[PDB]
C-alpha cells in the first residue's frame, strides 16, 4: 500500500495492537440488546467487511468521490469520521453499556455520510512512529495511533472479551473509559491500504 493515508479515497483495515489483536470489523447484524444498532467487532481474517475509510467530521460538508481536484492526508491530532465501506455507516458510540464489558460504552455502526451525530467524530492521536517518515501522517504498519471519541472522551478498544454466537463469537469492541495511555488494547495501526491515486509503497 501507499505510504500516506488519504481522506476519503484511502481504503484501510485497522489492526489492534494488544495480544490477540484483530481487525476492526462491521457486518449487517444487529446487537440483540443495548442500542440494537449494527454490530462492530474485531475479526481475525481478511475480509471486505474489514474495510474502512476516513471521512470529514460532522459539522463540515463531507468528502465525495467527485472531488477530483484535491488529495488530503489524514493528520495526527485532527478529527475524522470512520466509515464502514460496504455498509456506509459511521463508527459510532453513545452512553449505552457495551454487550459484555458492562462498565464500558457500546460501539456500533450507525447512520451514513449525511445522518448521525457528533459522537461519530473521533480524534486520531498518533502515539508511535517507526521510521523517519512524516510524523504527522498515518503510515501502514509503522504508525500506532489511538481513536478517541470527541464527545465522550473514551478510547476505541478491543476489550479482550468475545461476543456470543449472535456476534459469530468475534471480539467485543468498546469505548474504554479512563484508559491508560500505555493500554495497548487502545492502540491501532493501518494494516492494509489501497488507494489508486497514490504512489505504491514498495
Numbering used by the authors: 331 to 532
Copy text from the publication.
PMT-based O-mannosylation is an evolutionarily conserved and vital process, key for cell wall integrity and protein quality control in fungi. PMTs are divided into three subfamilies (PMT1, PMT2, and PMT4) and form functional dimers either within or across subfamilies (Akasaka-Manya et al., 2006; Girrbach and Strahl, 2003). In these structures each subunit has 11 transmembrane helices (TMHs) and two large hydrophilic loops oriented towards the ER lumen (LL): loop LL1 between TMH1 and 2 harboring a catalytic DE motif, and loop LL4 between TMH7 and 8, encompassing a so-called MIR domain, whose function remains unknown. MIR domains have a β-trefoil fold consisting of six β-hairpins arranged within a pseudo-threefold symmetry.
X-ray structures were determined by molecular replacement using the MIR domain of the stromal-derived factor 2 (SDF2) from Arabidopsis thaliana previously solved in our laboratory. The MIR domains of the PMT2 family reveal the canonical β-trefoil fold, comprising a six-stranded β-barrel and a triangular β-hairpin cap including a hairpin triplet. Given the high sequence and structural similarity between Pmt2- and Pmt3-MIR domains (68% identity, rmsd of 0.7 Å for 194 Cα-atoms), we focused further analysis on the Pmt2-MIR domain. An almost identical arrangement is found for Pmt2-MIR site β in the MIRm1-MIRm2 interface. Both cavities are filled by ligands present in the crystallization solvent (glycerol in site α [also in Pmt3] and sulfate in site β). Two MIR-motifs form almost identical surface cavities and are conserved in all PMT-MIRs, while the third site is specific for MIRm3 of the PMT2 family and is highly solvent exposed. Our analysis of high-resolution X-ray structures of the Pmt2- and Pmt3-MIR domains revealed particular ligand-binding sites (α, β, δ) on each lateral side of the triangular cap region.
